[PDB]
Design an enzyme around this catalytic site. Sequence first.
Site, PDB file in Angstrom:
ATOM      1  N   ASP A 238       0.825  -1.184   0.000  1.00 11.99           N
ATOM      2  CA  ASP A 238       0.000   0.000   0.000  1.00 11.99           C
ATOM      3  C   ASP A 238       0.872   1.251   0.000  1.00 11.99           C
ATOM      4  O   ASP A 238       0.708   2.143   0.802  1.00 11.99           O
ATOM      5  CB  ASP A 238      -0.914  -0.034   1.230  1.00 11.99           C
ATOM      6  CG  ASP A 238      -2.037   0.973   1.158  1.00 11.99           C
ATOM      7  OD1 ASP A 238      -2.505   1.270   0.009  1.00 11.99           O
ATOM      8  OD2 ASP A 238      -2.442   1.419   2.270  1.00 11.99           O
TER       9      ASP A 238
ATOM     10  N   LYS B 157       1.759   4.677  -1.498  1.00  9.86           N
ATOM     11  CA  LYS B 157       1.143   5.788  -2.221  1.00  9.86           C
ATOM     12  C   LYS B 157       1.547   7.056  -1.459  1.00  9.86           C
ATOM     13  O   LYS B 157       1.996   6.967  -0.297  1.00  9.86           O
ATOM     14  CB  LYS B 157      -0.368   5.628  -2.300  1.00  9.86           C
ATOM     15  CG  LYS B 157      -1.025   5.378  -0.952  1.00  9.86           C
ATOM     16  CD  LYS B 157      -2.542   5.179  -1.003  1.00  9.86           C
ATOM     17  CE  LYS B 157      -3.048   4.648   0.341  1.00  9.86           C
ATOM     18  NZ  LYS B 157      -4.463   4.210   0.296  1.00  9.86           N
TER      19      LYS B 157
ATOM     20  N   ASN C  62       0.861   7.543   2.093  1.00 12.67           N
ATOM     21  CA  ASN C  62       1.589   6.737   3.055  1.00 12.67           C
ATOM     22  C   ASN C  62       3.090   6.976   3.020  1.00 12.67           C
ATOM     23  O   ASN C  62       3.875   6.154   3.493  1.00 12.67           O
ATOM     24  CB  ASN C  62       1.303   5.278   2.827  1.00 12.67           C
ATOM     25  CG  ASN C  62      -0.106   4.886   3.235  1.00 12.67           C
ATOM     26  OD1 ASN C  62      -0.694   5.382   4.220  1.00 12.67           O
ATOM     27  ND2 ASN C  62      -0.652   3.944   2.489  1.00 12.67           N
TER      28      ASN C  62
ATOM     29  N   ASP D 139       2.179   3.414   7.520  1.00 12.29           N
ATOM     30  CA  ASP D 139       1.006   2.545   7.217  1.00 12.29           C
ATOM     31  C   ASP D 139       1.510   1.173   6.847  1.00 12.29           C
ATOM     32  O   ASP D 139       1.374   0.714   5.713  1.00 12.29           O
ATOM     33  CB  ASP D 139       0.072   3.141   6.124  1.00 12.29           C
ATOM     34  CG  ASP D 139      -1.407   2.638   6.203  1.00 12.29           C
ATOM     35  OD1 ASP D 139      -1.640   1.455   6.561  1.00 12.29           O
ATOM     36  OD2 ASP D 139      -2.348   3.444   5.838  1.00 12.29           O
TER      37      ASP D 139
ATOM     38  N   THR E  38      -4.468   0.195  -3.572  1.00 13.03           N
ATOM     39  CA  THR E  38      -5.272   1.356  -3.880  1.00 13.03           C
ATOM     40  C   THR E  38      -5.276   1.513  -5.392  1.00 13.03           C
ATOM     41  O   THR E  38      -4.273   1.289  -6.049  1.00 13.03           O
ATOM     42  CB  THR E  38      -4.726   2.600  -3.175  1.00 13.03           C
ATOM     43  OG1 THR E  38      -4.678   2.344  -1.763  1.00 13.03           O
ATOM     44  CG2 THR E  38      -5.610   3.817  -3.435  1.00 13.03           C
TER      45      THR E  38
ATOM     46  N   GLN F 198      21.673  -0.978   5.044  1.00 12.97           N
ATOM     47  CA  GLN F 198      22.606  -1.645   5.948  1.00 12.97           C
ATOM     48  C   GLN F 198      23.966  -1.270   5.450  1.00 12.97           C
ATOM     49  O   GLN F 198      24.160  -1.222   4.237  1.00 12.97           O
ATOM     50  CB  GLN F 198      22.517  -3.155   5.823  1.00 12.97           C
ATOM     51  CG  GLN F 198      21.145  -3.751   6.073  1.00 12.97           C
ATOM     52  CD  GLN F 198      21.162  -5.240   5.869  1.00 12.97           C
ATOM     53  OE1 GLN F 198      21.709  -5.718   4.884  1.00 12.97           O
ATOM     54  NE2 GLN F 198      20.624  -5.985   6.826  1.00 12.97           N
TER      55      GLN F 198
ATOM     56  N   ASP G 131      28.279  -3.774  15.771  1.00 16.54           N
ATOM     57  CA  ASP G 131      27.201  -4.628  15.296  1.00 16.54           C
ATOM     58  C   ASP G 131      26.532  -5.248  16.495  1.00 16.54           C
ATOM     59  O   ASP G 131      26.719  -6.410  16.812  1.00 16.54           O
ATOM     60  CB  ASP G 131      27.681  -5.702  14.323  1.00 16.54           C
ATOM     61  CG  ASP G 131      26.527  -6.517  13.728  1.00 16.54           C
ATOM     62  OD1 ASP G 131      25.370  -6.104  13.918  1.00 16.54           O
ATOM     63  OD2 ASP G 131      26.752  -7.563  13.068  1.00 16.54           O
TER      64      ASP G 131
ATOM     65  N   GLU H 230      23.551  -5.474  42.077  1.00 18.96           N
ATOM     66  CA  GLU H 230      22.704  -4.672  41.199  1.00 18.96           C
ATOM     67  C   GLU H 230      23.378  -3.374  40.772  1.00 18.96           C
ATOM     68  O   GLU H 230      24.366  -2.942  41.370  1.00 18.96           O
ATOM     69  CB  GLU H 230      21.384  -4.351  41.890  1.00 18.96           C
ATOM     70  CG  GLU H 230      20.462  -5.545  42.074  1.00 18.96           C
ATOM     71  CD  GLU H 230      19.082  -5.151  42.555  1.00 18.96           C
ATOM     72  OE1 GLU H 230      18.093  -5.749  42.086  1.00 18.96           O
ATOM     73  OE2 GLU H 230      18.990  -4.229  43.388  1.00 18.96           O
TER      74      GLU H 230
ATOM     75  N   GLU I  78      26.293   3.917  39.462  1.00 17.15           N
ATOM     76  CA  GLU I  78      26.913   2.806  38.789  1.00 17.15           C
ATOM     77  C   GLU I  78      26.636   2.888  37.280  1.00 17.15           C
ATOM     78  O   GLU I  78      27.558   2.828  36.463  1.00 17.15           O
ATOM     79  CB  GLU I  78      26.407   1.495  39.425  1.00 17.15           C
ATOM     80  CG  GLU I  78      27.031   1.248  40.808  1.00 17.15           C
ATOM     81  CD  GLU I  78      26.517   0.017  41.595  1.00 17.15           C
ATOM     82  OE1 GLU I  78      26.187  -1.027  40.996  1.00 17.15           O
ATOM     83  OE2 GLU I  78      26.514   0.140  42.830  1.00 17.15           O
TER      84      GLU I  78
HETATM   85  N1  LIG Z   1       4.007   9.785  12.130  1.00 20.71           N
HETATM   86  C1  LIG Z   1       3.148  10.610  11.498  1.00 20.71           C
HETATM   87  N2  LIG Z   1       3.346  11.935  11.398  1.00 20.71           N
HETATM   88  C2  LIG Z   1       2.501  12.761  10.743  1.00 20.71           C
HETATM   89  N3  LIG Z   1       1.366  12.328  10.168  1.00 20.71           N
HETATM   90  C3  LIG Z   1       1.058  11.005  10.209  1.00 20.71           C
HETATM   91  C4  LIG Z   1       1.930  10.055  10.893  1.00 20.71           C
HETATM   92  N4  LIG Z   1       1.379   8.837  10.782  1.00 20.71           N
HETATM   93  C5  LIG Z   1       0.268   8.986  10.063  1.00 20.71           C
HETATM   94  N5  LIG Z   1       0.079  10.277   9.735  1.00 20.71           N
HETATM   95  C6  LIG Z   1      -1.064  10.853   9.011  1.00 20.71           C
HETATM   96  O1  LIG Z   1      -2.187   9.998   9.234  1.00 20.71           O
HETATM   97  C7  LIG Z   1      -2.557   9.380   8.010  1.00 20.71           C
HETATM   98  C8  LIG Z   1      -3.050   7.977   8.266  1.00 20.71           C
HETATM   99  O2  LIG Z   1      -2.046   7.172   8.850  1.00 20.71           O
HETATM  100  P1  LIG Z   1      -1.864   5.655   8.337  1.00 20.71           P
HETATM  101  O3  LIG Z   1      -0.838   5.017   9.237  1.00 20.71           O
HETATM  102  O4  LIG Z   1      -1.714   5.760   6.857  1.00 20.71           O
HETATM  103  O5  LIG Z   1      -3.209   4.877   8.760  1.00 20.71           O
HETATM  104  P2  LIG Z   1      -4.325   4.251   7.774  1.00 20.71           P
HETATM  105  O6  LIG Z   1      -3.900   2.792   7.670  1.00 20.71           O
HETATM  106  O7  LIG Z   1      -5.573   4.234   8.631  1.00 20.71           O
HETATM  107  O8  LIG Z   1      -4.249   5.163   6.584  1.00 20.71           O
HETATM  108  C9  LIG Z   1      -1.349   9.464   7.163  1.00 20.71           C
HETATM  109  O9  LIG Z   1      -1.662   9.380   5.789  1.00 20.71           O
HETATM  110  C10 LIG Z   1      -0.774  10.799   7.562  1.00 20.71           C
HETATM  111  O10 LIG Z   1      -1.409  11.918   6.968  1.00 20.71           O
HETATM  112 CA   LIG Z   2      23.581  -4.991  13.017  1.00 20.57          CA
HETATM  113 CA   LIG Z   3      25.666  -1.997  43.012  1.00 17.55          CA
HETATM  114 CA   LIG Z   4      24.599  -1.543   2.010  1.00 17.18          CA
HETATM  115 CA   LIG Z   5      14.802  -2.889  39.819  1.00 15.31          CA
HETATM  116 MG   LIG Z   6      -2.759   5.442   5.009  1.00 13.15          MG
END
Ligand SMILES: Nc1ncnc2c1ncn2[C@@H]1O[C@H](COP(=O)(O)OP(=O)(O)O)[C@@H](O)[C@H]1O
Ligand SMILES: [Ca+2]
Ligand SMILES: [Ca+2]
Ligand SMILES: [Ca+2]
Ligand SMILES: [Ca+2]
Ligand SMILES: [Mg+2]
Length: 459
Positions: A134, A136, A139, A155, A174, A329, A370, A446, A451
Amino acid sequence: KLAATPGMFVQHSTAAFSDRYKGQRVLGKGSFGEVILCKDKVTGQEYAVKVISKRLLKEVELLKKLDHPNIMKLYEFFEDKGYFYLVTEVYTGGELFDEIISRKRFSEVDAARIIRQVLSGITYMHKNKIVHRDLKPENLLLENKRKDANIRIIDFGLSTHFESTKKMKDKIGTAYYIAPEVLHGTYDEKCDVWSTGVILYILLSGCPPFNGANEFDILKKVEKGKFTFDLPQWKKVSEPAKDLIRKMLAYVPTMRISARDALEHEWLKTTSIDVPSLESTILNIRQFQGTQKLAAAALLYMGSKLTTNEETVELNKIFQRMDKNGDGQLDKQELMEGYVELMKLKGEDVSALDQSAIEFEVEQVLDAVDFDKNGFIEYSEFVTVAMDRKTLLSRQRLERAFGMFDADGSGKISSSELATIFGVSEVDSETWRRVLAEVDRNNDGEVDFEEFRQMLLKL
Ligand SMILES: Nc1ncnc2c1ncn2[C@@H]1O[C@H](COP(=O)(O)OP(=O)(O)O)[C@@H](O)[C@H]1O
Ligand SMILES: [Ca+2]
Ligand SMILES: [Ca+2]
Ligand SMILES: [Ca+2]
Ligand SMILES: [Ca+2]
Ligand SMILES: [Mg+2]
């Protein structure tokens, strides 16, 4: 060998959401709830809380496995009688959708940068057997309001694990962005490529490549696969950009470019950093010595959960540049080239470098940094290690980390608390032995806040 990962730190809380957060405003609403800007009640720190009306362990579990500069960060989550709450990093630049409907059309430079990051995120996801399903503009978020702001994927609520052996059947996505094979019912991770290919088309032209009066009309257009560069705005666009678009929207899955390979496309590459910052970061990385597990968790916690976006912007750029292949990575070879790249920047002579000595130099860095022993330095490991230790080991961050470790509030970290932090039943008497032997002062079995403080404070 207990693996320290950012994900292990997100625990199913046993407090009420409202005991620790306060709503501020709505950022967005979704199909089954809304995302709400909250402040931590103690520290006024701001998060985006996704709320999901039960009237989904999985969106949380997938997110614990991901740690990537272009993927949304999960901090913790709560569950209610009626609800789930996913405490997330807030990204203040809003949706790519808004910027699309605003700027109308994107620079080839800006589009390549955006697409490179998306592709990096999914290459990483694909590596970890996760498909988004999904993608777009709605998202994708810009981190902040800056001109060329970093991109974050969000999302993960329709995302899932996939196996190379079996194929997916469920119809998800979508209309504009869904790949034809998803409609038909047999698909693999390449659907995410298709979606990104659609997104790239839109960014460069302002229009979707498959349109219609309504949903149904669009899906027919999509399922036919035919799209055109017949619009006037495309005369401006270079052939290589179109070439990538064609490869990403190749009708047939097997003929379609993977994310991993798309990163290498001429277009994305062809289209900055202060030497001091690079120098310090590489210096800070070289001087990190591995240590006992209590300290490791503490640092990774501080790096991965207690640093703000504002604090890591330099560090974020550096990582993506040191990641030559984009896959999110850093490997031995990429790390080697970072040092070398820095050496060039300082006028040193290439041939005058001991490649095998550096290789050894880097084998040891990797060993040190790491944290999860997966043979790669991931973003949060990078951040923890590369950030200036006085900055990172601020008095706040230290206090807050200990607080989180000391679960029962007792003012002392017990091995049981340590096991809990790791997500494991108890810690090897051997590994706990290895800890106290380096940290215990009073000598009481502890680790208390003094510490603790000295343990890390020896920078
Ligand atoms: N971390 C974030 N900061 C700012 N806006 C957010 C954030 N997370 C989601 N949104 C807003 O909320 C909307 C919906 O969140 P999303 O996780 O896509 O849920 P859904 O699955 O219900 O669409 C996003 O498209 C965005 O506009
Ligand atoms: Ca690692
Ligand atoms: Ca101690
Ligand atoms: Ca790499
Ligand atoms: Ca404790
Ligand atoms: Mg969404």
